[PDB]
Ligand binder design. Structure first.
Ligand code: HEC
Length: 104
C-alpha cells in the first residue's frame, strides 16, 4: 500500500477520533499505537464496549481489511461510528500507513 496516500485517508476519515503515536491521547476512540499483532480491545486505559473487547481477533492486514470495509458488521454494537471504506485500494493504503505510524 501507499503510505503517503494512507496518511491522507487517515486524516480525512479517522484522525478526528484517533491518534497513532506512542503516548498519543485517547479521544473519542482509543490511541492506536501498537495495534498490529494485538487482540481487540487492548489499548490501555480506554473504556471499550464489551463488543469490541469480546471480538477476540488479532489486528493485522487481513482483519483490518475486513473491519474497515464495514466496522459494525464486523463488531456489532461497537461505539465506533464510521460506516466503512468500500474501496480495497484505499483500505490497503490506509492499512500500510497504520502499519508504519502505529509502530514508530
Ligand atoms: C469516531 C467518530 C471514530 C471514527 C471516525 C473512527 N473511529 Fe475507530 N474507533 C472509535 C471508537 C469509539 C472505538 C472503540 C469502539 C468500541 O466499541 O469500544 C474505535 C475502535 C477502533 C479500532 C479497534 C481498536 C482496538 O480493538 O483496540 C480500530 C482498529 C479503529 N477504531 C480504527 C479506525 C480507523 C482506521 C478509522 C478511519 C477509517 C476509524 N477507526 C474511524 C471511534 C472512531
Amino acid at each position: 500500500g501507499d503510505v503517503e496516500k494512507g496518511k491522507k485517508i487517515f486524516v480525512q476519515k479517522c484522525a478526528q477520533c484517533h491518534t497513532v503515536e506512542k503516548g498519543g491521547k485517547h479521544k473519542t476512540g482509543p490511541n492506536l499505537h501498537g495495534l498490529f499483532g494485538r487482540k481487540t480491545g487492548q489499548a490501555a486505559g480506554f473504556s471499550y464496549t464489551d463488543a469490541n473487547k469480546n471480538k477476540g481477533i488479532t489486528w493485522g492486514e487481513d482483519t483490518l481489511m475486513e473491519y474497515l470495509e464495514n466496522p459494525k458488521k464486523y463488531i456489532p454494537g461497537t461505539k465506533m461510528i464510521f460506516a466503512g471504506i468500500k474501496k480495497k485500494g484505499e483500505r490497503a493504503d490506509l492499512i500500510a500507513y497504520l502499519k508504519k505510524a502505529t509502530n514508530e
